[PDB]
Amino acid sequence: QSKSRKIAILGYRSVGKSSLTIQFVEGQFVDSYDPTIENTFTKLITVNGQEYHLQLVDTAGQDEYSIFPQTYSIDINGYILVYSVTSIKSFEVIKVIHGKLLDMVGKVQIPIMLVGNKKDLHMERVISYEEGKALAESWNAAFLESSAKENQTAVDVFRRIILEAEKLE
């Protein structure tokens, strides 16, 4: 009598959706992964004594113009929205995505969190921790920063989204 969460991973293009997800499930940082591929990864994690069966949707990517059709919500238990702290564009884009996603959802409390990835690039960082935090807060969302190089930060991210579901249960 375990539970089952299905998580949508959303974000611009080359912000590390795949790399972050793969890191969590394989224990491995990959060099490249094909950015056409939508793939569902699976994983066990135990959270507050409850064994969870995760399905992780590594979406191909979105942008400003992308379209969230009415059906997308259907069987989605949670949404993780990812930008890169090195691409202002990806931060621009994630605000837009959030807007369209919040419209496609309507009223429901199905949790949404926000992640600043690529934190390991001290020299390439353009977005501050504060900047993304303010966004999350503005949405009443969770906010973590991450690195697909670092396993433990990835674990925090997919663990946190489950937590955020549990809050509302």
Ligand SMILES: Nc1nc2c(ncn2[C@@H]2O[C@H](COP(=O)(O)OP(=O)(O)O)[C@@H](O)[C@H]2O)c(=O)[nH]1
């Ligand atoms: N240094 C660093 N590179 C990353 C990180 N996350 C992703 N990358 C790299 O950025 C590119 C995009 O990764 P990917 O997961 O394919 O992004 P996606 O297109 O959103 O799935 C790849 O070249 C990765 O090797 C990170 O946290 N740190």
Ligand SMILES: [Mg+2]
């Ligand atoms: Mg990808």
